[PDB]
Design a protein around this ligand. Structure first.
Ligand SMILES: Oc1cccc2nc(C(F)(F)F)[nH]c12
Ligand SMILES: Oc1cccc2nc(C(F)(F)F)[nH]c12
Ligand SMILES: Oc1cccc2nc(C(F)(F)F)[nH]c12
Ligand SMILES: Oc1cccc2nc(C(F)(F)F)[nH]c12
Ligand SMILES: Oc1cccc2nc(C(F)(F)F)[nH]c12
Ligand SMILES: Oc1cccc2nc(C(F)(F)F)[nH]c12
Lengths: 158, 158, 160, 160, 158, 160
């Protein structure tokens, strides 16, 4: 039984995130999609809203468990009995910070292996931030988000 | 009649921006210098101040039209009958975000072509943000800004 | 403005990525010269005549494209072709660094030539002629990245 | 899930950086094939037999590692080895650009193969077989970057 | 007598910063570790706290002088009779902004030479920001900070 | 402190970019050795004697510059020259990745040698000896990027 954690702010979860978590379930027995509270990022959606959106978005994937956390992600991964930490790698700018976070996590929990997955070309140029910006300007974001997420983002901005 | 839009925050417009818009007028019949309201960026100058500064800075260029907008830039480009979207490419860090914005704009308006122009070596290491920082510390920024802009930035910080 | 633009490269062979870029350029410029470098230093898989014939066939549906070979400096050719626009396809960060060096050098050589960077479809943003040739040489399927005529010529080339 | 993973490369020679990556892969995957490319185009310092023998000796303490040579496309080998995971070591930004091109090409060639990027220790994050060979050829001390058997073979190679 | 300035926010000073300033004292006769007030960065520690922490952290280095400044760093370097400006180069992302700052400083003070030093592999993936984030989540940061700094960060977050 | 610094490279040929870097180094270090690599692997346009003579002429106005050739590892030369400072010119992101690999390797080889990165004028931030030679070989104007003596020698070299 191999347990992987996929941590992030997921404010909100996008098709890019769905792509990564799906690739993770094909590789590992159990995947914990872990939503960081991230108050420093001043998130659009509350932790509870992000958890509900991700639960509904990944309900079709049987080996996905969605959980929120305010803890240090290394402690949360230890407490979830995870030995793999998944992160998606879109481009060079993300990669630089990903190395810092992975080297820090390695110092905090050496047995937790950080692995990087690459999203499809389709989602290689999107982010939660970019989708929110288009949506703040009433631009069509239906293509980039699960149905429930799209509806929730429409509601939040109305 | 080929119509290009050059969108940005232009808070404030710099010689780097003047260089790009000038290169755009040598290539296209009509260039719309489009100033985004950008409230998320908490701009130093109001949209109306940015419009007036850019109007005065580009008045020597006959085929430049300066306009402000709070709309989605793809809708604004459609509404201006533009088929070309100009962006300046200084370095690698800008380029990464430019690809995301251009792929998003392509999804929103496929017939709007994003084109990138490269500024002179002279303005390749400046930004509105950098100029404002030097100016907040009373450093000489006369070299990087049009006269009217320099005067307005002095006034704003006094 | 009746703009003449040049789109230079080795095109060894021409890919769907190059077709995407030259198609975008024809939508904004009146005349586009797709200029094929003799490129001796690189030692191309296809001869210049083969490269020109392939690009001609693959761009025949584009009325404002002219396929031409050249052996001079790409600024000297642009100058003599009366081009004022230099098309460069931009895929990612790694090439961008060399692109800025090339664009500043071209500006020194010919100030009246303006470098314009176009972005290909996400579909072709991660390929190159180099990678396509390597995959094909090693018995990989590259059909999806090439015009049909290029696919046919590449199989014939690798067979012998 | 009884996962089969492949870790391909030229391994010319195998370094402590490669050992670090293959050790991390054995901790998360049931069987790891360390696959050594014939790699003619590059013209390797060590022959394929030498490279295979060195990697075998240097990974002998890892029970779930299989050292194997291959000459086909790395996707064709992975497919025939029934591997569903492709291990790639990630050191820095420069290689990352080529890594995304390689990973998208491998996904086109074999959708059922998943590219996974592992990060080496900070200790090996700034070395390559290329840099190690260059230093050693120029009479520099590379003992710290190599398994002991590799260090012995490299001195013997450079002596003659 | 060669005088170098090592400017930064140092919020708080890390072992990465200690590594750079130590390398600077082996190269130059006198090194001024200059702490920018940086109010735009909303620093965790006041300028006076950052000065005291850095003074205590570098007291073992005889040719280090710690000073705070709210001035333009080019004017401060001129006023300190410095001809060398030290900056540490961790990775690509820092480098891009470092070039802008160095080209700006060169415009402000041409005789001030910006030099870049490379930290040890040990500190190549850390930053004040990253250390503060781990510490906000009660993660162990003793390895990345001088003793006095670690204690002060514990206190501040308690 | 009476600092000895080394500024190594192939200098094939020496450009205004190299002159800018070595001039900045003489302003902060007591003695600067401009060290020219034999560099066989690269196959230089100018011989080592030609490269040394050109750099000598182009730096003659700088009293604390010594032009010297070397064939050893650049750390072995620095050690034997009693240099404690290694000057590296930094132009852009692409070279920076290799610069960190080189600097960490040089630190392993000679801990007492400190790598210092200097920034050239914006004027020379987008050129290289490689690009200059390519332009010149292809009948482009490179006068602006070179010392006058280098410009004269380059025309003579390309003529024959
Ligand atoms: O384990 C961690 C390592 C480095 C940074 C971190 N930031 C968090 C948190 F914000 F809680 F998600 N956990 C971290
Ligand atoms: O068309 C757009 C695409 C992507 C992001 C965008 N942000 C804006 C706006 F803020 F209004 F300028 N328009 C966008
Ligand atoms: O105009 C150019 C500028 C810089 C380099 C160049 N190399 C060529 C050539 F190879 F000839 F096509 N043209 C160049
Ligand atoms: O599967 C591959 C994808 C892309 C390029 C590749 N080059 C090889 C080979 F050299 F044969 F090992 N395999 C590749
Ligand atoms: O000399 C400077 C050049 C560029 C930006 C600058 N920002 C400062 C300050 F914030 F004061 F530290 N000084 C600067
Ligand atoms: O000291 C060095 C460190 C790393 C690589 C190196 N290659 C050389 C040489 F080519 F010999 F000049 N010196 C090096």
């Amino acid at each position: 039984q191999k347990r992987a954690i996929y941590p992030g702010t997921f404010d909100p979860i996008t098709n890019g995130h769905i792509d990564i978590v799906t690739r993770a379930t094909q590789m590992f027995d159990h995947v914990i999609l872990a939503i960081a509270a991230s108050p420093s990022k001043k998130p659009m959606f509350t932790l509870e809203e992000r958890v509900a959106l991700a639960q509904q978005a990944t309900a079709h994937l049987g080996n996905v468990e969605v959980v929120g956390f305010s803890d240090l992600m290394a402690n949360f991964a230890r407490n979830q009995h995870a030995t793999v930490l998944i992160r998606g790698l879109r481009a060079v700018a993300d990669f630089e910070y990903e190395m810092q976070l992975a080297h820090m996590n390695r110092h905090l929990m050496p047995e937790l292996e950080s692995v990087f997955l690459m999203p499809s070309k389709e989602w290689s140029f999107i982010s939660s931030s970019l989708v929110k910006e288009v949506a703040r300007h009433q631009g069509d974001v239906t293509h980039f988000l699960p149905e429930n997420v799209h509806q929730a983002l429409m509601a939040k901005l109305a």
